[PDB]
Design a protein around this ligand. Structure first.
Ligand code: AKG
Ligand code: AKG
Ligand code: CO
Ligand code: CO
Lengths: 281, 284
């Protein structure tokens, strides 16, 4: 079976745009240096050391390993991994027909030994209107998957069904129609809208949990699933302009016919109503 | 030639949804009281009195000088925020119309005040703020609804909004002629409700004496779509003054798109936005 193509971090973005249309996904090898991986990894340990919260938990009081919206608690994500110039090179070429994009969610899944595999899916459930966009329409969503520990056949490496954005519906494919996304920490797996995929769980026995940070970059026409509006101004203003636009703190622009912009108030740019400073203001 | 159907404010909502299905639009007669209309205009007058720009006007700079514009009236006009925006007949229509998509909220609400001698608007669909709407099949769950408020009477002379009935079924907006449209001639207090994908335009003000035409447009869209105007800079005493419904409309609460989204949207820290904010509301 044709496997996921592996490209170097400085590969040709024109080539990456062809892989996403042909196969539906590709892999960047070693996009992020290991010490950025280790920084992010030690910042998530801090979060998994947080006391259990004495209130509701939307996806977590839903179940009997989860770190939501990692951009607000891990400075390594929001100030390094969020603004990776290769990723933004891929998003600009990918989103060229639909316009500006921003971060709709970024969270952590940890999969301990003995956990079952994840069902086949598309990342289409949060904004169900995507279910009804035809294949030829400008894409509105792009999945960016960061292995924080090794992805293996044995620990549940993500399974991607190549070319499956051409199916109208998911149905119920069998694990054997997919290929594995084995990767080193620092690698990245990019997944096109409508491509069927599934985490593999962790059939192992010895205690080594698989770690994956999942970032969904959507058209700015699509409401961010995570709202980053409660960040402190002081944390917001030490980000770059690029980061603030991802986290929804600036006015944005879908491609024409939206000839004005989006996320604005007082007929002014949100960053000017708030008089927002930025690290690269 | 068939016209827009005027209904009673107390009309069955199935009747309303039905007319949005085949005609694409209809009018409610006498939804808002006159006392509600006159103070909205007073508040708009307070805002119209303000000289407008020492600089950039994102929307107003983008369109010819054929109208005057007051943006995001929910933040400056108490009558809209506390009465018009939470009108139950408007919400009965929305809850029935957005049944398949789940929660809806307010993408924008603004005043248009059109001066005599301005030319007619061109026939558009309101699928430009979110261009992905062009691509939904007609039969897919709708994600946008336009609510058009006469703040003066609408007449053939002042430019009552021109609606082409059934135009949401067309493949393309195309090259439409004026007498394809029927006029939403209305009096202050009525409401024009216009389904997604209906082709339409504001008329030219061909009056010679009297006050300009005023219309307030409110766009309710699925909570899946990003609001054009963001109400996140309203004062906390102002937002806590609103009702739960009013706060859900203006983006201050976690919302729920239909399944397969079984979690929601507009949340943080895996909790509801209003919980994280300890947000009081007027009726909870
Ligand atoms: O766990 C993985 O590697 C896949 C996660 C995923 O695709 C999801 O959580 O939707
Ligand atoms: O409907 C009206 O009269 C106002 C004009 C309009 O529809 C628009 O600006 O989109
Ligand atoms: Co997924
Ligand atoms: Co319009």
């Amino acid at each position: 079976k044709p496997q996921l193509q592996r490209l170097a971090a400085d590969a040709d973005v024109d080539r990456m745009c062809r892989l996403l249309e042909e196969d539906g996904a590709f892999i960047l090898k070693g996009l992020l240096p290991f010490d950025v991986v280790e920084s992010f990894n030690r910042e998530l340990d801090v979060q998994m050391a947080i006391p259990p919260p004495k209130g509701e938990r939307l996806l977590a009081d839903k179940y009997p390993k989860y770190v939501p919206n990692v951009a607000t608690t891990c400075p390594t994500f929001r100030n390094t991994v969020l603004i990776n110039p290769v990723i933004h090179a891929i998003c600009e070429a990918y989103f060229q027909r639909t316009g500006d994009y921003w971060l709709s969610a970024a969270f952590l899944r940890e999969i301990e030994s003995g956990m079952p595999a994840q069902p086949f899916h598309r990342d289409d459930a949060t904004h169900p209107l995507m279910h009804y966009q035809p294949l030829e329409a400008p894409p509105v969503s792009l999945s960016v998957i960061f292995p924080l520990t090794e992805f293996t056949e044995e620990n549940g490496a993500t399974e991607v069904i190549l070319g499956s954005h051409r199916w109208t519906e998911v149905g119920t494919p069998e694990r054997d129609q997919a290929v594995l996304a084995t990767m080193d920490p620092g690698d990245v797996l990019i997944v096109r809208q409508r491509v069927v995929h599934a985490g593999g769980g962790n059939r192992t026995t010895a205690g080594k949990p698989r770690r994956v940070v999942l970032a969904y970059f959507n058209s700015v026409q699509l409401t961010p699933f995570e709202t980053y509006r409660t960040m402190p101004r002081e944390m917001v203003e030490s980000m770059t302009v690029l980061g603030q636009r991802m986290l929804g703190w600036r006015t944005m622009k879908p491609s024409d016919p939206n000839i004005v912009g989006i996320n604005l108030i007082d007929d002014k740019r949100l960053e000017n109503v708030l008089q927002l400073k930025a690290a690269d203001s």
